[PDB]
Amino acid sequence: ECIENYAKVNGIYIYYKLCKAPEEKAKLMTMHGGPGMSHDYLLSLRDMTKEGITVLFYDQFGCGRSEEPDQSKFTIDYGVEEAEALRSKLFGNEKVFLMGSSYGGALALAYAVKYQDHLKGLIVSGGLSSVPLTVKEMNRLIDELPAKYRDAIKKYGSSGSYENPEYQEAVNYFYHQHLLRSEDWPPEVLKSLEYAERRNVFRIMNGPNEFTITGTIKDWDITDKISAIKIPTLITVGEYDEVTPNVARVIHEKIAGSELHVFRDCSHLTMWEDREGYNKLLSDFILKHL
Numbered sequence: 001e002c003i004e005n006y007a008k009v010n011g012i013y014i015y016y017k018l019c020k021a022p023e024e025k026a027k028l029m030t031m032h033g034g035p036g037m038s039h040d041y042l043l044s045l046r047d048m049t050k051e052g053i054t055v056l057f058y059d060q061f062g063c064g065r066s067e068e069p070d071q072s073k074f075t076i077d078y079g080v081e082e083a084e085a086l087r088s089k090l091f092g093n094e095k096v097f098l099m100g101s102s103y104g105g106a107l108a109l110a111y112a113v114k115y116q117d118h119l120k121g122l123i124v125s126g127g128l129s130s131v132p133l134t135v136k137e138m139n140r141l142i143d144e145l146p147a148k149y150r151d152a153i154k155k156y157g158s159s160g161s162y163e164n165p166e167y168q169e170a171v172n173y174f175y176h177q178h179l180l181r182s183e184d185w186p187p188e189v190l191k192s193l194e195y196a197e198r199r200n201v202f203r204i205m206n207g208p209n210e211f212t213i214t215g216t217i218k219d220w221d222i223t224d225k226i227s228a229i230k231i232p233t234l235i236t237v238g239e240y241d242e243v244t245p246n247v248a249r250v251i252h253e254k255i256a257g258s259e260l261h262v263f264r265d266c267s268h269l270t271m272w273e274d275r276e277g278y279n280k281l282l283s284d285f286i287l288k289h290l
């Protein structure tokens with residue numbers, strides 16, 4: 001079982017879940033995506049605890065069970081500071097491994113740029129160093145979908161009719177192809193999705209859905225800053241990932257000595273599409289960089 005708490009970080013109450021031991025060899029901090037989702041969908045990473053890896057989960061500001069700060073604090077930079085405050089006021093000055101999924105991947109990159117000295121390694125899964133680039137790629141994926149859904153996305157999406165059933169049907173299709181390739185989605189994932197729709201972070205920072213970014217991160221791009229990361233880095237991405245391997249390649253290029261692994265037959269939530277394989281990869285990476 002894990003230890004759950006609702007502690008006050010640098011100003012706001014953040015919910016976190018720490019699953020540690022037995023035979024702890026390293027600590028791994030995780031950053032969920034969205035922005036505006038929850039740690040819930042990363043619970044599958046809990047398996048690594050049996051490999052000597054302590055896993056820390058937490059709901060970022062305004063996410064899941066955590067309280068929402070002032071609107072002005074809805075930025076990646078604030079998220080980074082929040083992450084460091086949590087790491088310190090919990091692990092002291094210990095060097096920890098950092099993993100981020102999608103937006104959490106971007107968030108993990110921003111963190112590394114400033115606090116890599118507190119890290120022993122970095123893991124970016126379905127992450128991105130450029131939203132504009134990510135958008136370009138997803139736009140290609142849209143055009144590749146069957147006209148039936150592609151047209152619906154361009155039609156209703158252009159008129160702001162996200163409530164339309166045809167549009168929603170097209171959105172769902174895209175998800176079952178580039179978000180999670182499964183007909184039986186795990187409760188953990190559905191819960192994070194529910195949290196994204198219930199809170200305000202996703203709507204404000206991101207937009208209506210995964211491929212419609214009108215939020216405050218639409219122009220975020222730190223590709224020219226990530227080459228500064230010199231710590232061991234593991235970059236993963238799915239073959240049919242909504243944040244395509246081309247975006248992952250861009251990250252891979254900048255971080256010298258970084259590793260890039262493309263999961264075949266998988267998309268964005270590779271932690272569930274290939275749980276054993278995904279956990280094994282990260283576990284080996286972590287254990288080989290102690």
Ligand SMILES: *[C@](O)(CCl)[C@@H](N)Cc1ccccc1
Pocket residue numbers: 032033034035037101102103104131134135206210211213243
């Ligand atoms: C990940 O957070 C989802 Cl788990 C993803 N929404 C990040 C993202 C994708 C495309 C454009 C902006 C952000």
